[PDB]
Amino acid sequence: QVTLEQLLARITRNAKKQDCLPPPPPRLAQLVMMLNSELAHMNRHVRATARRSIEAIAAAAQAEVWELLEPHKKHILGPIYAKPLRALPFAIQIGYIDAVTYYMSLKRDFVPFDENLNRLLMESLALADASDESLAGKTLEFRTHDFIVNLRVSCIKILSRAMSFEEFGSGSNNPTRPKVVSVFFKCLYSDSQPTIDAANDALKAVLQHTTKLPKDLLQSGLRPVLASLQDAKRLTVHSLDNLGRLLRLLTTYFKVEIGTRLLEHVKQIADPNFLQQLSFTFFEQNNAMKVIAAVFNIFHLLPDAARQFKERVIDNVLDLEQKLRRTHHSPFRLPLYKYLNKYPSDIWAFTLQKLEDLRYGRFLAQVLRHPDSQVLRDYGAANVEFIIKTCNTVVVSGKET
Amino acid sequence: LHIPQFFLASEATSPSFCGILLRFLMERIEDVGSADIKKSSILLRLFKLAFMAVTLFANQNEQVLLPHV
């Protein structure tokens, strides 16, 4: 790749738009045709190198990529439309999808919305809507799983790119866009990180662009996550992760009392004998502790209305630590710090309101010594004067504490 | 290095310390191929100690090593 970069830089020293296009001979016409040919290869590195070389050639010649690629678009497009996409192996499907996605991003009108493109998009949607067992069967083999994940990611990306085109789904009025959003939501709850990231990005982009959401579609999207949060015994980490992702996505949609329900679940799980037995060992890998930590993690994502549970959560954490006999360290410390760092004024005021008690100043001092607690340190630096004033009031009050 | 080895060989403290050591080493795993003999040799020796400790107490340490395998 380095040698290819050097050669391309050297040969294009004095390029001009006339030499990079066919006659109305040109030096770089054959080179550009050859490079454009390899944009649908089954090897991702080949595609990356081809597109990088094309962009480098275009920049030096002072032109636009679509101008260079307009004459040769057929050579790449024709083969893709000639076969049903549901029969080819995984690698060929992925290459074709990626090539079409890149081609329809140079400019809005580069790829017309003819019958073939619509058929390809429906095929991609159907592929993304399938199941691991259906797609040749998931034998747990590593390579098949990787192929399936990559294919799903490519389908999601092409659908997201098609969403930006107002034409897609508008001229139909049939449930295409609703189905696309439903598939996005279904993919956002998968067990694979790459597809989860792709789905999250596509969904956030769609939500920002649309600016509004039908009530029924969002009700359907939000029903599955709230379905599993009606039983403490059935609470699992994955459901809490999905809820956190949704909260990060739809900021001003959810409501209060979910935190109270989660705290009730926590109290249910934290059996006294269970904790007494969990002590005397390394419980950081126990499932129940992981569930409790996951529950704690959500509080720092809720809207401002969650500010009223600070005392409750602090009391719960301190009592749990007392039960387990831990100090300076526990699985619940990190999310608690993350949450408490969002309300520096409130936490400062609450802590200074109970300066007499020794159990809270110690906790605040422990919190402030963490590397990631910077906003609290800034607020403390700002209000050192008030802190000293209140402490002077306490000392001059004339007590034994 | 004789301190971790002594801790792991002992029956009483082997499980918890093995778990802590594995949880710590799985973050630096990326430094095992750093091409600096001094840095990589220590990591390799620590991994060897952890696996030997797993071997010694089969029925107690297997559950600790199961997640990272």
Description:
This is part of a larger assembly, with two copies of chain A. Chain A has 401 residues and is mainly alpha-helical. Helices cover 63% and strands 0% of the residues of chain A. Chain A has helices at 2-11, 29-37, 44-61, 65-69, 73-81, 90-103, 115-128, 142-163, 177-187, 193-210, 215-227, 237-249, 258-269, 272-278, 287-298, 310-324, 333-340, 344-352, 358-368, 375-382, 384-396. In chain A, helix 15 (287-298) packs parallel to helix 17. Chain A is elongated, with a radius of gyration of 29 Å. The N and C termini of chain A lie far apart (73 Å). Chain B: This is Non-specific serine/threonine protein kinase. Chain B: Associates with DNA double-strand breaks. Chain B: Belongs to the PI3/PI4-kinase family. TRA1 subfamily.
Short description:
Chain A is mostly helical and about 400 residues long. Chain A has 21 helices and no strands.
SSE blueprint and pairings:
The structure is cut from a larger assembly and holds 2 copies of chain A.
Chain A: H1 2-11, H2 29-37, H3 44-61, H4 65-69, H5 73-81, H6 90-103, H7 115-128, H8 142-163, H9 177-187, H10 193-210, H11 215-227, H12 237-249, H13 258-269, H14 272-278, H15 287-298, H16 310-324, H17 333-340, H18 344-352, H19 358-368, H20 375-382, H21 384-396
Helix pairs in contact in A: 5-6, 6-8, 7-8, 8-10, 9-10, 12-15, 13-15, 15-17
Main sheet makeup of chain A? none
Could you give the distance between the termini of chain A?
73 Å
* Subunit organisation of the chains: part of a larger assembly
Classify the helix fraction of chain A into a percent range: 55-70%
Strand-and-helix sequence of chain A, N→C?
HHHHHHHHHHHHHHHHHHHHH
* Strand residue content of chain A: under 5%
Structural class of chain A: mainly alpha
Q: What gyration radius of chain A follows from the Cα positions, in whole Å?
A: 29 Å
Number of strands of chain A: 0
Count of helical segments of chain A? 21
Shape descriptor of chain A? elongated
| Pair of chains with the largest interface and how many residues each contributes | A-B, 4 and 7 residues
PDB class: transcription
Keywords: ctSAGA complex, Histone Acetyl Transferase (HAT) Module, Tra1 module and Core module, transcription
Entry title: Tra1 and core modules including core tip of ctSAGA complex
Chains A, B: Non-specific serine/threonine protein kinase
